[model samples]
Target: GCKAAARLGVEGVFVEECFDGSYCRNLERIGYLRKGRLEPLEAAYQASRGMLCMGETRGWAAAVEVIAGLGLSLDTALVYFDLRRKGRKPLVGVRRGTLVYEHGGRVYEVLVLSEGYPLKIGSLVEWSRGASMDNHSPIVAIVDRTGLITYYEARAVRSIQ
Candidate 1:
């Protein structure tokens, strides 16, 4: 996959199957590290506190619509599940999308798909589909298909926990 992306002129790759500690470590090696836990989460809440906080709703919805348009449904469509720690308390601001959403007293974090040449989930459907880009949220990749590399917007959600 990396090679394919490279062939397409992508520079950064945002992986979505972020399930293990090793993956986190690998990302760190590549200059992408987890945004700590508490403070970043708090900031995320602030960034996503105001609006309706839809994700790259148009992109995601477009994907869903495409699937449904082809006669897919909840059952027919591929879904993935993983263990997450949503914490025990609720924050003031809340939002939902493929990524996390949080509303702070003053601001909100609405992380969404990044800005670049968007790659459809079609490329990864066989190995893994509907996976989180990071433990904290969804992910988006800015790919230069001509360059065959991607620049990743690592966080795809917002949170306050």
Candidate 2:
């Protein structure tokens, strides 16, 4: 229940669905009890709970409905979860097919086309036109499917070579 490093992609997605009072010991390791209706570590716990390690185990496999959605296709889930982690609070884009990032108080959209469902470069041109016309920045994230992300930005469609 304790760690001192940034989370792996999967670690921040799952939360305890439920736990008993006996698990309070794990709570103690993180924060002292507030002890109201078993809301034990009600103080600083809220701030720190995101750091716990799910470790190497069967735990994450069982927390379906989990954070994003258990119904997510395997491809979508992988990109979806990683973006939430690295994008620092992304929203489903204003346009249904994109993901939105409000990093540093600026709007940016990510175009991440999964492998089996790739899009034409024309689609990229169209998306950039949409963002640049809206006066927002645009980025394309290429998913290599090996759990690595490469961010390549073409700025606005007409704005880039």
Candidate 3:
């Protein structure tokens, strides 16, 4: 579509899944009512929090507080991986796991578990090969306790910690 539009001397772009597209507009409408404001990615966060709160909203009362804590500490730390060109990577030590950082008057320490690949989900069957053989894709993500996103990855198992 974009290529066709370019050939026709179009001046505007039509996005199918970009931020200004239909999906984000729908999410903004639904998120505002359930939560308060629409602060960019906060919509997804609030919706997931609402689901987890489920029968008892108070269950997630402290969720925001925890996220604030994470935000304060996460960027200060760096997670390094010792990986081979073709093999799994091992979880090495963190940069700021226990160190104290002082910015202006605030102080914070990094504290996050270094999760590692601990298992293999068997092997692919023969005959299927690249066409039909199902591949084992392991996933990892830094999801908040309330199911909000931080980051995600999908691949094979890495070296165990």
State which candidate has the highest lDDT: 2
- List the candidate 1 regions with Cα displacement exceeding 4 Å: 1-39, 47-112, 124-161
Ranking by lDDT: 2, 1, 3
Q: After superposition, how far is residue 72 of candidate 3 from its true place, in Å?
A: 21
For residues 27-49, could you state the per-residue lDDT of candidate 1 as single tens digits?
Answer: 45533233422222222221122
Which stretches of model 3 miss by more than 4 angstroms? 1-28, 31-61, 64-117, 123-161
Give per-model CA RMSD: 19.3, 9.6, 19.0
Weakest lDDT window of 10 consecutive positions for candidate 2:
36-45
Q: Each candidate's lDDT (Cα)?
A: 0.27, 0.47, 0.26
For residue 80, give model 3's deviation from the true position in Å: 21
Report the poorest 10 consecutive residues by lDDT, candidate 3. 1-10
